[PDB]
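hey so i finaly got around to running the thing on protein Lp49 from Leptospira interrogans. pasting the sequence first so u can double check i didnt mess up the copy paste, my clipboard has been acting weird all day
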Amino acid sequence: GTEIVKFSIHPYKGTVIRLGEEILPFKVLEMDKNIALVEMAIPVYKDEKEIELKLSSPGFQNSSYRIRKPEELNEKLIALDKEGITHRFISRFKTGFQPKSVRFIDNTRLAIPLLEDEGMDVLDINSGQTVRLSPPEKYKKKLGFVETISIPEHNELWVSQMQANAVHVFDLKTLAYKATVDLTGKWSKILLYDPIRDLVYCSNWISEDISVIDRKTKLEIRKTDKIGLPRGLLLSKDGKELYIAQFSASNQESGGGRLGIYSMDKEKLIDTIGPPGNKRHIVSGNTENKIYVSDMCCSKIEVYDLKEKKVQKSIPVFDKPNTIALSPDGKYLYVSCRGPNHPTEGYLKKGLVLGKVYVIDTTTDTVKEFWEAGNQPTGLDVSPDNRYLVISDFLDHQIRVYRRDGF
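ok and heres what it spat out for the 3d tokens, dont ask me to read them lol
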């Protein structure tokens, strides 16, 4: 006989599921833009016969979904790959509430701070094995875990907690809680590590400054003057300049952020470059003089020339580009796009349009491919071996895992 299963399909429109070359009818339970929760009857295949579901949809590559038993499909998301893309959907994994960022700590495991949950998930994308890392009760109850850095040379994993103006340190091998740095700034978010000076920098959203923490002692040793409203950070190759993504000019205005240039030696902001907007994330390019910056104002990635001290190119992407990451081989820049803000209710509410992921060819600085993901893609990283790209669907409390062709 049959088993009734419930799972999600993306896209729903035009999509057929067949089994043994016959239609397997399904019933729509819920619709969320192009993602459908559906229920379907699957026959119980006997005598070691594999159930191969065949999915097809206009403008999408065919997928086969193989299961030993109907039950295996329950609570799954099947997402089809858009025609012509070279990154293929592997899995969706549920996380705790509001996974704000993701970071590979090795080839397959991710550290995932949870903005509305009691710590950080550590999740293996091979198996879906998860474990929750938490600071002591007094901290963990405040929620608001944001960003990480991994420091394997000292066997540490650091996570900022904006709701406690703190940064927590875990042992990277044992996953045990190790220490907490209580900061004197407010609303700590982005972390950066400097291996030369052995310091960790922390962007403080509310106090509009950066905390400098001695990595060894777990103590904040100094903090900058106000340097705009910061988020992303990047330290120059020579270690002499700190690049600050100003999300805005200050907490008193909505925009006017530029790329800040902070002289480490002079301990001051010496320049601000690029046009005004909401600079978010910063990474180094595959060449020396090149940095990429996401600008949340204007659906764009900016390519800065550091010597020239300005933008050499803006690459158009989708609405609200947030986290970006260079592939280890430098061939691609990956971009998470949150999507347009709900037109009436703003960004705190699920949008009427799903977010997207973009792949930028760094040789030409043009978009090679892109596709639709879930509600508010926010976290993004690529595995150190080039193999996997992972994004967090922030309002869906999950990650989507993709695999690069040829890796």
